């Protein structure tokens, strides 16, 4: 039975699998230099990390 | 040479010896020339409270021998 | 009472050190000094974002192993018991089941980190 | 028991501490960093003087500009210096850092680190002999021997 | 199988030792003649008072005094 | 003295309240560590030490894992504290004031079987065996190996099954 | 009198931490073909005081991104616990006789990690967070084997008290029956302190300083001295448990002397090891402790559960 | 109880340590042991409906041993009256109540 | 004793209140659950020590065991939730309305 609350309701999927908004990756960016001892002095080395 | 290191080692050794000797001598000085009584179980604590009471002054290390039974 | 005394003495020593470290020296505060450190350049983001964990399963397992340790710790007393065969058998069963769980995790590659 | 005498002795003590314990920063840009190393080496043992390379500016007391300073690197150098806590000293090592040196007339070189940060001591050479850099460290030690801060506070 | 045990003893000796010690811990109690004495000792300790019994007059096997030669002796523990 | 155990219980209450106010799980784990420390203190003040040290170690490990997790799943750009939100700070202070009110009004209208400010410290250790040798708490917890063998197999199987279950849940 | 005993136990420990920094520098120097401090004082016995005074004379940092409360609490707690772990130690007589002294040690140590955690989180810098997570991993790695090693040893002592080990070793060290457990305990104490090869919490080659990177003179000094105090503490633990000083009730001074000798040996060994080896990768530490030490640790726990039974050598309860 | 498997096989997995009057380690005794024993022995063979009326005296003695509301009330009233007296100066605690006692033995 | 037990009961009730009154984060609710566990463990240990019933101390340790197992599976579910939505928020698992 429809109501003003159940108008936006959509019938669920046939396999219980829901097309879901693809949440993009959030990769921690880090300036590994310069002034870092490993970096031999003038290297910045911007890199992305998952952990 | 390598024997230039013995000063620091000797200093730290003295400093690490001080605590134990100090604790022992202080326990003796405060508990009547005896080792601080250990109360690991309630029986020892009962003994110590008995001693505290029977001793004229409330202190467990004043040992009362056969001089106090007649 | 003496334990309280010693621990509070240590609290006070540390706090005195920190007080005389924060109020004795001359200061000159400005934003470029008080700003975070990221190897000479400016951070591209905040450090308060999800830092993914690749050993989460091993940590979960560590919880249960800590509990098994909690159950193993009463042995010094359990060995003073008349029923010695029961204590022996139960301890052996406990340690063996622990090892079997660890082995299953190992084989199924739980101790290895997500990449 | 004059307060001025007491203050002079206290300042001697302050400077002795800040001097016999100079922790520089692992900040080497170019060739001159090699002579920095060699001054960390057995022949010239830095720690013998109380010198210790700490990698964080928030723990360092001095920074040796050991090589050429490009325009792409000057912001980071000024930032690191800014992040070092007072008292903070600076030492220019080589000819690249003092006045650009062999690359003075280049489009990508600052003709002196003294434009971006204030410099206490200049060590000339290309590269400066590690012995010379040590001479400069001790020159800095003496300069610190002559700070006379608390005497100034008492005279104010 | 000997070759497998051998290449494991060469490659992963830590697990070999672990299983061996596991088995020895599980076995040796079944082997020793001093296993029976653990419970006997843990029973010999008087953590409580030996509450005496009323002399009904029908306890011949029971002693009237500690130094009366009756009851459990601890010689097996005095010379063990 | 005499106010000792009551102060411990009140600190435990305040810790649990600041926890229930749900700030960033960092400060919540902090409050839980503090509450476990206070619980250890009070359990020691009632006679038993093994259980207190135990729960303390357990919750320390747990909050370690929880820190590791919240830094990865339960973090925010600006994590909330008790002071951050005026409403949360206000309800915290309000809860302290309400505890004070409840205590001071129960002492008056209520009987002494719940809160007796006069008579405090008289009922902690009702009875004791002055001549005793075998009263440590670990004796009971060791009974698991000899007498209460059922609890032991139960808990061990719970942990075994937990290993298998967490593996199955975390499978991708 | 008790406060005087507190002093005689506290101030020497701090002096020993300072001169331990000294001995560290000089030993590593002579291993590296160099001298080490000899300028500041006679053979360098004033370099630690110079460092400390200089630090407590520097401008500390109150950054803009930090949670100042934890940022300030963490070093307080670190130092407090580093000094509190020394109280229940028998040398041969402790200042605080605890029946569950081993568990006090365990809990206080497992607590000292939260100083690192909260420091690295408060600092609000990426390298600080990395150091904190590495500490999490390190603890998750070593804490499992620590307690089981210790239990397996204590199953011949009879209690968690640190003063029954003295009567247990009255005739013979606990190293002979437990040298495997002793080795594993040595490496795990090496890890508990974030000490090389396990200096991952402040790994300068990957993380400029780790949880210290935003910390400055005073609080940093607190962290550092806490580290160098826990070092001596764990050496003392090794040499009270597995190595046994001579206990003759009329001669506790000899006990303290030999205790000190062995502690110096073990600490110098820590420094030796820092000088001799590279640094692990913090996943390899987990793999080690969970694939070579934990299986063997369980096997030895079972072995030492059984040994008192098929030997009739169950220890006494007081 | 719902499935009395134990009472069938004749075992005891969880029922030998339910109440305080059960066998404790090293033959110690939980407090209120005798009160609990008497309550249980009275409530045996008659049911919980009768026991709520016929073992009421014993259950109440047990409840008082364990919770001790009445000893609390009594000592509180005594202390209250004594405080009133001292307030209005009609009482002085004897020596053995002020620390100064003959500490036997 | 009575004041201690009253305060521990009030603490359990506060932690239950927190568990019932959700906020955005789930781990906070898990922590409130752990706080309830703590309260109950402490109450049981205090009762067993006040009664001198050393046959009931094996109970609270089991309480802790099972509470920590619950926490473990909760953390695993939290992992899955974060993988799905990227966050541990509760307002995101509202698609089973149909
Ligand atoms: C266990 C840890 C042991 C280590 C800790 C032990 C440290 C004890 C050191 C004692 C020395 C006390 C004097 C140190 C003062 C240094 C502070 C400083 O340099 O500021 C200069 C300040 C500068 O004063 P000012 O008035 O000239 O500053 C003017 C404004 N500026 C700086 C911007 C130009 O002098 C003082 O005011 C301090 C007076 C000394 C007495 C302070 C108490
Ligand atoms: C046990 C936990 C206590 C549970 C009840 C909460 C009581 C404190 C609430 C007051 C607000 C504190 C707060 O969250 O501020 C954020 C701060 C974080 O820093 P901040 O965000 O307030 O930074 C403010 C900067 N200034 C100082 C310039 C304004 O953290 C704290 O202060 C509280 C940390 C919890 C520590 C609890 C142990 C206290 C130890 C005794 C001292
Ligand atoms: C305040 C913010 C900072 C907080 C950090 C403070 C440092 C924490 C240090 C870690 C402590 C965690 C472990 C809990 C304390 C140790 C408990 C203990 O050792 O036993 C308590 C002791 C009696 O113990 P026991 O010997 O076993 O009993 C027989 C004695 N005849 O005797 C006692 O009952 C004394 C109990 C008091 C325990 C000391 C706690 C002090 C807290 C100060 C704050
Ligand atoms: C019971 C009646 C509640 C009265 C209605 C108040 C509604 C409410 O505040 O509860 C929801 C609250 C979470 O609210 P939140 O999602 O954070 O959104 C911001 C709130 N303006 O939930 C919470 O704040 C959690 C409260 C738990 C702690 C309560 C202890 C209060 C101390 C007394
Ligand atoms: C290439 S290498 O292999 O050579 C490499 C090996 C490692 N290395 C090294 C080893 C130990 C110390 C240091 C100097 N150092 C000292 C401190 C620091 N020390 C104190 C302190 C507080 C109170 C003290 O006692 C009292 F003052 F009395 F209270 C004493 C000291 N606070 O912060 C902090 C950071 C730091 O680097 C350096 C040299 C170089
Ligand atoms: S001054 Fe010479 S040696 Fe130094 S960095 Fe420049 S070119 Fe290299």
Give me the residue spans of the domains in chain I.
2-98
Structure tokens belonging to residue D17: 């501490």
Q: Where are the alpha helices (DSSP H) in chain C?
A: 2-23, 31-34, 56-72, 75-78, 84-107
What is the spatial distance between Cα C106 and Cα C112, in angstroms, rounded to a whole number? 8
CA angle B27/B31/B32 to nearest 5° reads: 120
**E14 CA to centre of own chain:** 30
Cis peptide, bond prior to residue H29, ω within 30 of zero: no
Structure tokens belonging to residue A3: 């109501």
Judge contact between D46 and D86, C-beta under 8 A. Answer: no
Contact residues, chain G, for E37 at CB < 8 Å:
312
Listed residue (F50, F43, F58) closest to F138, CA to CA: F50
Q: Best of D35, D36, D70, D95 to mutate for ligand 6, by most ligand atoms within 8 A of CB?
A: D95
Q: Where are the beta strands (DSSP E) in chain G?
A: none
3-state SS, C19-50, equals: HHHHHCCCCCCCHHHHCCCECCECCCCCCCCC
Structure tokens belonging to residue B58: 């409330």
Residue in A with minimal Cα distance to D69: A42
What is the spatial distance between Cα C21 and Cα G217, in angstroms, rounded to a whole number? 8
C-contacting chains (≥3 CB pairs under 8 Å): A, D, E, F, G, I
Listed residue (G112, B7, I22, D70) closest to C10, CA to CA: G112
Structure tokens belonging to residue C53: 């964990």
D108's enclosing H/E stretch is none
CA angle E50/E53/E59 to nearest 5° reads: 120
Q: Give the pairing type, strands A28-31 and A46-49.
A: antiparallel
Residues 6+ apart with CB under 8 A from G65: C35, C36, C46, C47, G123, G124, G125
What is the spatial distance between Cα C36 and Cα D58, in angstroms, rounded to a whole number? 10
Judge contact between F65 and I75, C-beta under 8 A. Answer: yes
CB half-sphere exposure, I73, CA atoms < 13 A: 15
Residues 6+ apart with CB under 8 A from G70: G118, G119, G121, G122
Domains (range + CATH), chain D: 2-156 (3.40.50.12280)
Residue of F50, F127, F132 to mutate for B, most B C-beta atoms under 10 A: F132
First to last CA, chain D: 20
Residue of F9, F65, F153 to mutate for I, most I C-beta atoms under 10 A: F9
- CB neighbourhood size of G277 (10 A): 10
- CB neighbourhood size of E73 (10 A): 9
| Contact check, Cβ <8 Å, H25/I54 | yes
Judge contact between C10 and G79, C-beta under 8 A. Answer: yes
What is the spatial distance between Cα D114 and Cα D101, in angstroms, rounded to a whole number? 13
Query: b/e map of G89-120 (b: 16 or more CB within 10 Å)?
Result: bbbbbbbebbbbbbbbbbbbbbbbbbbbbbbb
What is the spatial distance between Cα G143 and Cα F127, in angstroms, rounded to a whole number? 38
Which residue's entry shows tokens 């952990």? A51
Length of chain H, please? 105
Contact residues, chain C, for F84 at CB < 8 Å:
none
CA distances from A1 to A6, A9, F148, G174, I94 (A): 9, 11, 57, 79, 20
Structure tokens belonging to residue G209: 């300083």
What is the spatial distance between Cα G72 and Cα A22, in angstroms, rounded to a whole number? 41
The answer to whether residue G318 neighbours chain E at the CB level (below 8 Å) is no
Alpha-carbon torsion G201, G206, G211, G217, what sign? Answer: positive
The DSSP bridge partners found for residue A31 are: A46
Query: b/e map of H70-101 (b: 16 or more CB within 10 Å)?
Result: eebeebbeeeeeeeeeeeeeeeeeeeeeeeee
The count of structural domains within chain B is: 1
Residue in H with minimal Cα distance to I49: H30
Judge contact between D114 and D101, C-beta under 8 A. Answer: no
**What is the position in ligand 4's atom list of the atom closest to the CA of F92?**
32
Q: Is H10 helix (H, G, I), strand (E, B) or coil?
A: coil
What is the spatial distance between Cα G4 and Cα G85, in angstroms, rounded to a whole number? 18
Residues 6+ apart with CB under 8 A from G125: C36, C37, C38, C43, C47, G65, G213, G214
Nearest bound ligand to the CA of residue F95: 4
| Contact check, Cβ <8 Å, H105/B50 | yes
Q: What is the signed CA dihedral for D111, D113, D119, D121, rounded to 10 degrees?
A: -70
Give the annotated binding-site residues of D for [4Fe-4S] cluster: 31-32, 96, 126
| Contact check, Cβ <8 Å, G295/E80 | no
Residues of H with CB under 8 A from a CB of E: 26-27
Q: What is the signed CA dihedral for F59, G182, G304, I69, rounded to 10 degrees?
A: 20
A30's enclosing H/E stretch is strand A28-31
- CB neighbourhood size of E50 (10 A): 8
Burial class (CB in 10 A: 0-12, 13-18, 19+), A4: exposed
CA angle H76/H79/H80 to nearest 5° reads: 85
What is the spatial distance between Cα G263 and Cα H7, in angstroms, rounded to a whole number? 60
Judge contact between I19 and I29, C-beta under 8 A. Answer: yes
D64's enclosing H/E stretch is strand D62-66
G196's enclosing H/E stretch is none
Q: Is F37 helix (H, G, I), strand (E, B) or coil?
A: helix
Listed residue (C25, H89, B49, I38) closest to D87, CA to CA: C25
Structure tokens belonging to residue C112: 């290895």
Query: Is residue D121 within 6 Å of ligand 6 at its C-beta?
Result: no
What is the spatial distance between Cα D57 and Cα C38, in angstroms, rounded to a whole number? 11
Instruction: Specify the DSSP class assigned to residue G207.
Output: S
What is the spatial distance between Cα C42 and Cα G64, in angstroms, rounded to a whole number? 14
What is the spatial distance between Cα G116 and Cα H82, in angstroms, rounded to a whole number? 55
**What residue owns the CA closest to ligand 5's atom 16?**
G51
Judge contact between F54 and C70, C-beta under 8 A. Answer: yes
Q: Is D2 helix (H, G, I), strand (E, B) or coil?
A: coil
Judge contact between F136 and C78, C-beta under 8 A. Answer: no
CA angle G45/G51/G54 to nearest 5° reads: 135
Query: Is residue F81 within 6 Å of ligand 2 at its C-beta?
Result: yes
Which residue's entry shows tokens 């019994």? E53
Tell how far the Cα of C1 is from the centroid of ligand 3, in angstroms: 9
Do the two chains G and D touch, given a threshold of 8 Å on CB pairs and at least 3 pairs? yes
Judge contact between F12 and I7, C-beta under 8 A. Answer: yes
Q: Is D62 helix (H, G, I), strand (E, B) or coil?
A: strand
| Contact check, Cβ <8 Å, H72/F147 | no
Judge contact between I80 and I47, C-beta under 8 A. Answer: no
Judge contact between F32 and F25, C-beta under 8 A. Answer: no
- CB neighbourhood size of B12 (10 A): 25
I-contacting chains (≥3 CB pairs under 8 Å): A, C, F, H
**What residue owns the CA closest to ligand 2's atom 42?**
G73
Listed residue (G178, G15, G168, G30) closest to G92, CA to CA: G168
Residue of G4, G8, G46 to mutate for B, most B C-beta atoms under 10 A: G8
Residue of A16, A23, A24, A51 to mutate for I, most I C-beta atoms under 10 A: A23
Domains (range + CATH), chain C: 2-115 (1.20.58.1610)
Distance from the A29 Cα atom to the nearest Cα atom in chain D, whole angstroms? 18
Query: Is residue F90 within 6 Å of ligand 2 at its C-beta?
Result: no
The count of structural domains within chain G is: 1
Architecture of domain I2-98: Orthogonal Bundle (1.10)
Phi, psi (degrees; rounded to nearest 5) at A15 = -120, 15
First to last CA, chain G: 29
Listed residue (B50, H94, H96, D54) closest to G58, CA to CA: D54
CB half-sphere exposure, B36, CA atoms < 13 A: 17
Tell how far the Cα of D109 is from the centroid of ligand 6, in angstroms: 13
Judge contact between G92 and G245, C-beta under 8 A. Answer: yes
| Contact check, Cβ <8 Å, I55/H23 | yes
Listed residue (G69, G132, G133, G78) closest to F23, CA to CA: G69
The DSSP bridge partners found for residue D63 are: D90
Contact residues, chain I, for A20 at CB < 8 Å:
84
What is the spatial distance between Cα I5 and Cα I40, in angstroms, rounded to a whole number? 10
Phi, psi (degrees; rounded to nearest 5) at C31 = -60, -45
- CB neighbourhood size of I77 (10 A): 16
Listed residue (F64, G210, G121, A27) closest to C52, CA to CA: A27
What is the spatial distance between Cα D94 and Cα D77, in angstroms, rounded to a whole number? 16
The ligand 5 site (C-beta within 6 Å) comprises D 47, 52, 54; G 14-15, 17-18, 21, 24-25, 28, 48-49, 51-52, 55, 221, 224-225
**G276 CA to centre of own chain:** 19
The answer to whether residue I98 neighbours chain A at the CB level (below 8 Å) is yes
CA distances from G130 to E15, F170, G175, G208, G282 (A): 33, 24, 37, 10, 11
Q: Where are the alpha helices (DSSP H) in I51-98?
A: 58-85
Domain that residue G66 falls in: 2-318
Q: After which residues is chain I broken (C to N over 2.5 A)?
A: none
Phi, psi (degrees; rounded to nearest 5) at H80 = -65, -50
CA distances from G306 to D18, D38, E31, F20 (A): 60, 59, 12, 47
Phi, psi (degrees; rounded to nearest 5) at A48 = -110, 145
The answer to whether residue C37 neighbours chain G at the CB level (below 8 Å) is yes
What is the spatial distance between Cα B18 and Cα B35, in angstroms, rounded to a whole number? 18
Tell how far the Cα of G51 is from the centroid of ligand 5, in angstroms: 7
Structure tokens belonging to residue G142: 């070593």
What is the spatial distance between Cα F61 and Cα I2, in angstroms, rounded to a whole number? 31
- CB neighbourhood size of D118 (10 A): 11
Listed residue (I29, I31, I35, I44) closest to I10, CA to CA: I35
Contact residues, chain B, for H105 at CB < 8 Å:
50, 53-54
DSSP assignment of B9-63 equals HHHHHHHHHHHHHHHHHHHHHHTTSSPPPP-SSHHHHHHHHHHHHHSSSS-TTS-
Residues 6+ apart with CB under 8 A from D2: none
Longest dimension (CA), chain B: 72
Judge contact between I4 and F115, C-beta under 8 A. Answer: no
Listed residue (G161, G78, G64, G179) closest to G119, CA to CA: G78
The answer to whether residue G27 neighbours chain E at the CB level (below 8 Å) is no
Tell how far the Cα of F87 is from the centroid of ligand 4, in angstroms: 9
Alpha-carbon torsion F130, F133, F135, F137, what sign? Answer: positive
F-contacting chains (≥3 CB pairs under 8 Å): B, C, E, G, H, I
Distance from the F88 Cα atom to the nearest Cα atom in chain H, whole angstroms? 38
Alpha-carbon torsion G70, F8, F45, B26, what sign? Answer: positive
What is the spatial distance between Cα G78 and Cα B28, in angstroms, rounded to a whole number? 33
Domain that residue B44 falls in: 1-70
Q: In what order do the strands lie in the sheet with D89-93?
A: D62-66, D89-93, D121-123
Judge contact between D83 and G214, C-beta under 8 A. Answer: no
Tell how far the Cα of D65 is from the centroid of ligand 6, in angstroms: 11
Judge contact between F104 and F96, C-beta under 8 A. Answer: no
Instruction: Specify the DSSP class assigned to residue G42.
Output: G
Which residue's entry shows tokens 């066998």? H23
DSSP assignment of E38-68 equals HHHHHHH--SS--------S--TTS-SSTTS
Residues 6+ apart with CB under 8 A from D55: A35, A36, A37, D25, D26, G204, G208, G209
DSSP assignment of chain H equals --S-HHHHHT--SSSTTSSTTS--GGG---TTHHHHHHHHHHTTTT-HHHHHHHSHHHHHHHHHHHH-HHHHHHHHHHHHHHHHHHHTT-----GGGTT------
What is the spatial distance between Cα G221 and Cα A25, in angstroms, rounded to a whole number? 40
**I83 CA to centre of own chain:** 24
Cis peptide, bond prior to residue C42, ω within 30 of zero: no
CA distances from I32 to D50, G114, G220, I37 (A): 51, 20, 34, 9
What's the count of helices (H) and strands (E) in chain I, helices before strands?
Answer: 3, 0
- CB neighbourhood size of F106 (10 A): 17
In chain G, % helix, strand, coil (3-state, to 5) comes to 65, 0, 35
CA distances from H20 to F89, G107, H69 (A): 45, 32, 19
Structure tokens belonging to residue G188: 């795990």
Contact residues, chain G, for B43 at CB < 8 Å:
none
């Amino acid at each position: 039975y429809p109501s003003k609350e159940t108008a936006h309701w959509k019938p669920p999927p046939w396999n219980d699998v829901d097309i879901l908004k693809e949440k993009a990756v959030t990769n921690m960016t880090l300036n590994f230099g310069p002034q870092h001892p490993a970096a031999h002095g003038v290297l910045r080395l911007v890199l992305e990390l998952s952990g | 040479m390598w024997f230039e290191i013995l000063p620091g080692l000797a200093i730290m050794g003295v400093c690490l010896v001080i605590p134990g000797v100090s604790t022992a001598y202080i326990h003796k000085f405060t508990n009547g020339g005896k080792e601080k009584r250990v109360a690991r179980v309630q029986y020892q604590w009962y003994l110590m409270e008995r001693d505290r009471r029977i001793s004229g002054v409330n202190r467990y290390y004043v040992s009362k021998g056969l001089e106090n039974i007649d | 009472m003496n334990l309280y005394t010693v621990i509070f003495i240590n609290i006070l020593l540390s706090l005195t050190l920190i007080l005389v470290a924060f109020w004795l020296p001359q200061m000159n505060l400005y934003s470029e000094k008080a700003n975070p450190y990221e190897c000479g350049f400016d951070p591209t983001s905040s450090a308060r974002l999800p830092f993914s964990m690749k050993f989460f399963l091993v940590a979960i397992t560590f919880l249960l192993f800590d509990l098994e340790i909690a159950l193993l710790l009463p042995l010094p007393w359990a060995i003073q018991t008349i029923k010695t065969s029961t204590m022996m058998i139960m301890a052996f069963i406990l340690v063996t089941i622990l090892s079997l769980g660890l082995a299953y995790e190992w084989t199924q590659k739980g101790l290895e980190w997500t990449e | 028991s004059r307060a001025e005498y007491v203050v002079t002795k206290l300042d001697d003590l302050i400077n002795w501490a800040r001097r016999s314990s100079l922790w520089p920063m692992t900040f080497g840009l170019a060739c001159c960093a090699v002579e920095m190393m060699h001054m960390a080496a057995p022949r010239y043992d830095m720690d013998r003087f109380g010198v210790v390379f700490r990698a964080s500016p928030r723990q360092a007391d001095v920074m040796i500009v050991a090589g050429t300073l490009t325009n792409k690197m000057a912001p980071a150098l000024r930032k690191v210096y800014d992040q070092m806590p007072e008292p903070r000293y600076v030492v220019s090592m080589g000819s690249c850092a003092n006045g650009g040196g062999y690359y003075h007339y280049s489009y990508s070189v600052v003709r002196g680190c003294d434009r971006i940060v204030p410099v206490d001591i200049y060590v000339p050479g290309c590269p400066p002999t590690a012995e010379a850099l040590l001479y400069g460290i001790l020159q800095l030690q003496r300069k610190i021997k002559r700070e006379q801060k608390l005497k100034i506070w008492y005279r104010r | 199988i000997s070759a497998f045990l051998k290449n494991a003893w060469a490659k992963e000796p830590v697990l070999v030792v672990s299983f061996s010690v596991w088995g020895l811990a599980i076995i040796m109690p079944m082997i020793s003649p001093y296993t029976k004495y653990a419970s006997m000792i843990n029973k010999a300790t008087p953590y409580n008072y030996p509450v005496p019994v009323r002399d009904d007059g029908n306890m011949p096997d029971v002693p009237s005094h500690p130094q009366d030669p009756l009851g459990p002796s601890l010689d097996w523990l005095k010379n063990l | 003295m005499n106010n000792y155990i009551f102060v411990l219980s009140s600190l435990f209450l305040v810790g649990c309240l600041g926890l229930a106010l749900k700030p960033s799980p960092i400060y919540g784990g902090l409050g839980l560590i503090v509450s476990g420390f206070v619980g250890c203190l009070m359990v020691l003040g009632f006679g038993g030490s093994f259980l207190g040290l135990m729960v303390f170690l357990i919750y320390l490990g747990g909050m370690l894992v929880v820190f590791g997790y919240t830094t990865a799943m339960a973090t925010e750009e600006y994590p909330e504290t008790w002071g951050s939100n005026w409403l949360i700070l206000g309800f915290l202070v309000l809860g302290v004031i309400m505890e004070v009110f409840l205590i001071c009004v129960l002492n008056y209208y209520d009987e002494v079987g719940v809160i007796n400010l006069d008579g405090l410290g008289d009922w902690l250790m009702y009875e004791v065996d002055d001549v005793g040798v075998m009263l440590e708490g670990g004796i009971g917890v060791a009974a698991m190996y000899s007498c209460a063998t059922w609890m032991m197999v139960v808990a061990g199987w719970s942990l075994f099954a937990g290993i298998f279950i967490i593996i199955e849940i975390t499978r991708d | 009198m008790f406060f005087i005993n507190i002093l005689t136990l506290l101030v020497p420990i701090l002096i020993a931490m300072a001169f331990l920094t000294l001995v560290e520098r000089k030993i590593l120097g002579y291993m590296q073909l160099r001298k080490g401090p000899n300028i500041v004082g006679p053979y360098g016995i004033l370099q630690p005081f110079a460092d400390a005074m200089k630090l407590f004379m520097k401008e500390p940092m109150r950054p803009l991104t930090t949670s100042m409360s934890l940022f300030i609490i963490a070093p307080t707690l670190s130092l407090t616990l580093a000094l509190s772990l020394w109280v229940p130690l028998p040398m041969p007589h402790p200042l605080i006789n605890l029946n569950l002294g081993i568990l006090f040690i365990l809990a206080t140590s497992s607590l000292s990690v939260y100083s690192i955690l909260w420091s690295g989180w408060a600092s609000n810098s990426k390298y600080s967070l990395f150091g904190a997570l590495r500490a999490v991993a390190q603890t998750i790695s070593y804490e499992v084997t620590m307690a089981i090693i210790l239990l397996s040893v204590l199953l011949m002592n009879g209690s968690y008290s640190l003063q029954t080990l003295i009567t247990t070793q009255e005739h013979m060290w606990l190293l002979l029956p437990a040298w495997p457990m002793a080795m594993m305990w040595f490496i795990s104490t090496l890890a508990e302190t974030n000490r090389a090869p396990f200096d991952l919490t402040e790994g300068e080659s990957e993380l400029v300083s780790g949880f210290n990177v935003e910390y400055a003179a005073g609080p940093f000094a607190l962290f550092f001295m806490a580290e160098y105090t826990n070092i001596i503490l764990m050496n003392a633990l090794t040499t009270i448990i597995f190595l046994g000083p001579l206990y003759y009730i009329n001669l506790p001074e000899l006990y303290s002397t030999n205790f000190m000798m062995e502690a110096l040996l073990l600490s110098s060994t820590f420094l030796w090891i820092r000088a001799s080896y590279p640094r692990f990768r913090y996943d390899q530490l987990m793999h080690l402790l969970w694939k070579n030490f934990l299986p063997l640790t369980l096997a030895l726990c079972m072995w030492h559960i059984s040994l008192p039974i098929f030997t009739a050598g169950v220890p006494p309860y007081m | 109880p719902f499935l009395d498997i134990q009472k069938k096989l004749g075992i005891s997995l969880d029922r030998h340590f339910m109440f305080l009057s059960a066998e404790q380690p090293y033959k110690n005794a939980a407090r209120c042991h005798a009160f609990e024993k008497e309550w249980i022995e009275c409530a045996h063979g008659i049911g919980g409906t009768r026991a709520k009326k016929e073992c009421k005296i014993e259950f109440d003695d047990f409840e008082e041993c364990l919770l001790r509301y009445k000893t609390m009330r009594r000592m509180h009233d005594i202390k209250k009256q004594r405080e009133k007296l001292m307030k209005e100066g009609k009482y002085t605690p004897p020596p053995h109540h002020s620390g100064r006692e003959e500490p036997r033995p | 004793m009575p004041s201690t037990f009253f305060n521990l009961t009030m603490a359990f009730s506060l932690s239950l209140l927190g568990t019932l009154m959700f906020r955005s984060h789930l781990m906070s609710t898990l922590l409130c659950l752990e706080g309830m566990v703590l309260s109950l463990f402490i109450m049981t240990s205090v009762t067993s020590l006040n009664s001198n019933s050393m046959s009931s101390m094996p109970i609270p340790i089991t309480i802790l065991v099972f509470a920590a197992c619950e926490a473990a599976v909760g953390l695993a579910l939290l992992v899955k939730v974060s993988n799905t939505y990227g966050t541990d928020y509760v307002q995101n698992l509202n698609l089973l309305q149909c």
